[PDB]
Design a protein around this ligand. Structure first.
Ligand SMILES: [Co+2]
Ligand SMILES: [Co+2]
Ligand SMILES: [Fe+2]
Ligand SMILES: [Fe+2]
Lengths: 314, 314
């Protein structure tokens, strides 16, 4: 009814279950892959995905939210592929993933026709497949909020009030880009409780994370395993600190794991040293057990992975 | 032998004939089209291309050089498609078309692995099709020369000395980006007589065009029809001025025509007003007849469309 899915009927919101709010089956750069597919292996990418998913459903993961959109190589027909061999609840989304500028096609185009693209994937269907998006993704990083960056953000604020779907953001933790994202969305009639400032777990600063959580929006401690931004343990203490400070009603956890990633700054041979234990179920081996071992109840974990996402999708 | 082609054997250089140095069968943004192909029509795009080409071979056009690369939607299998139904000499190329930054895949990647991509298309084959590139394309515009912009330029300077193929540039006429492109290439052991600073016909300033031509490189009066940069007549007088000033040995002419272009800032309904007569054979109806009518011999036109390109490919 409310929450769309992939290769399956649309759920409501309370039947969402244990959810991994931020994960990636596989990412790639549309341009290169389309120009040189001799570098890729549909098979290797399908297996890793399949293998990684089935193991998340074990630890009790019910629904996986995949924020793969334009620029990350969103393949809806590749999404159904794995959903069929694993039977996973996969919420597809829309939007555009960028840091600086838009593709050339966007030259001299209004912000509306941009939000038009998103509104199309929500109500019509992603890539003419019927599978609709459940949200909209937007990204800001080191280069901070620029012209093209802001255009997409405001186009998200519109795709939100018109479709009623939520929006998940991608930001640099030490930048303030997260706050900027929250502000620019809030000023445009965007429901804070309907915005996920992500990756803000890549930093110790608990005051920056708090104020953003105080602003009403969901905070993103979503990149566990990626030690290169912040080691696992350094991350666990942060989550901890906030849980005791009563921010669990806004804390959402995930990995941001890419079964197969395109960038060279994250080669499969770069795993060790950069992200040794980074996986789709790392928070089951380390994080969760860590909290319950430090005095956090079962209600909190079910709140984070169940009740928080439910409030995010309705 | 020297000059590679598409769906045919590689020519030498003197058998190049009358050539349109800069033309586009069709351009599109890899990302969007790959994410939403419901906006495109393989058919409409094939016909326009086919129709436009056959009419250029009439006016005596022997070889067409298509500078469509990453970012413009280079489709080698779509190139052979038309080459077969028209039997045209089509020189494919490589490189990257940008204004600001590279795709994410290029994050933390050396300039070598970039030139590696180009060197692959030259000696191995474009997109694993055997069809090799005859040159490398690079672009700079209003945003001028930036980090990512310069990285590709220097990666071109390398792909040039190692493969021996020439490089065609895309620049803003009123910016100096053209000169910047020439300089950064020259400083890296790049043969000026092996660089095509393009689009510098979009401006009156004949002193800027001259110095660039004096620097040894080929000048680009290559966008006839696109009145929006400079009307046809305003362009003709410029070419004229330089021909009388003995710069014809460096003048190369084309249209830069896109049978089917992706950007909205150039919609098929925007043709009139922006570029009314813009086509693949506009210089036959207007330009050429104009010169021979103002006292320029037959040797000059054959030099521009035959001898100049021959020196550019060898
Ligand atoms: Co992200
Ligand atoms: Co150009
Ligand atoms: Fe992500
Ligand atoms: Fe062009």
């Amino acid at each position: 009814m409310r929450i769309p899915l992939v290769g399956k009927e649309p759920i409501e919101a309370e039947d969402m279950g244990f959810t991994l709010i931020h994960e990636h089956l596989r990412v790639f750069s549309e341009a290169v892959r389309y120009q040189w597919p001799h570098l890729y292996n549909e098979d290797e990418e399908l297996r890793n995905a399949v293998n990684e998913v089935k193991r998340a459903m074990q630890f009790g993961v019910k629904t996986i939210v995949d924020p793969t959109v334009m620029g990350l190589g969103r393949d809806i027909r590749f999404m159904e592929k794995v959903v069929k061999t694993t039977g996973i609840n996969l919420v597809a989304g829309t939007g555009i993933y960028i840091y600086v500028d838009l593709p050339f096609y966007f030259l001299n185009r209004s912000i509306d026709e941009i939000a038009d693209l998103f509104i199309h994937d929500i109500k019509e269907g992603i890539q003419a497949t019927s599978n609709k998006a459940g949200f909209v993704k937007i990204a800001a990083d080191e280069p901070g909020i620029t012209k093209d960056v802001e255009k997409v953000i405001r186009a998200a604020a519109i795709t939100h009030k018109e479709a009623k779907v939520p929006i998940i953001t991608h930001s640099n933790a030490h930048n303030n880009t997260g706050l900027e994202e929250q502000r620019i969305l809030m000023e445009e009639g965007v429901d804070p409780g309907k915005i996920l400032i992500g990756h803000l777990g890549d930093t110790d600063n608990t005051d920056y994370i708090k104020k953003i959580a105080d602003k009403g929006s969901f905070i993103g401690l979503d990149r566990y395993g990626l030690d290169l931004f912040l080691p696992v343990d350094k991350r666990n203490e942060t989550t901890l600190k906030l849980i005791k400070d009563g921010y669990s009603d806004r804390i959402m956890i995930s990995h941001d794991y890419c079964c197969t990633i395109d960038w060279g700054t994250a080669r499969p041979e770069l795993k060790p040293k950069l992200a040794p234990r980074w996986s789709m179920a790392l928070i089951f081996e380390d994080t969760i057990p860590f909290l319950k071992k430090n005095g956090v109840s079962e209600e909190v974990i079910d709140i984070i992975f169940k009740e928080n996402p439910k409030k995010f999708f309705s």
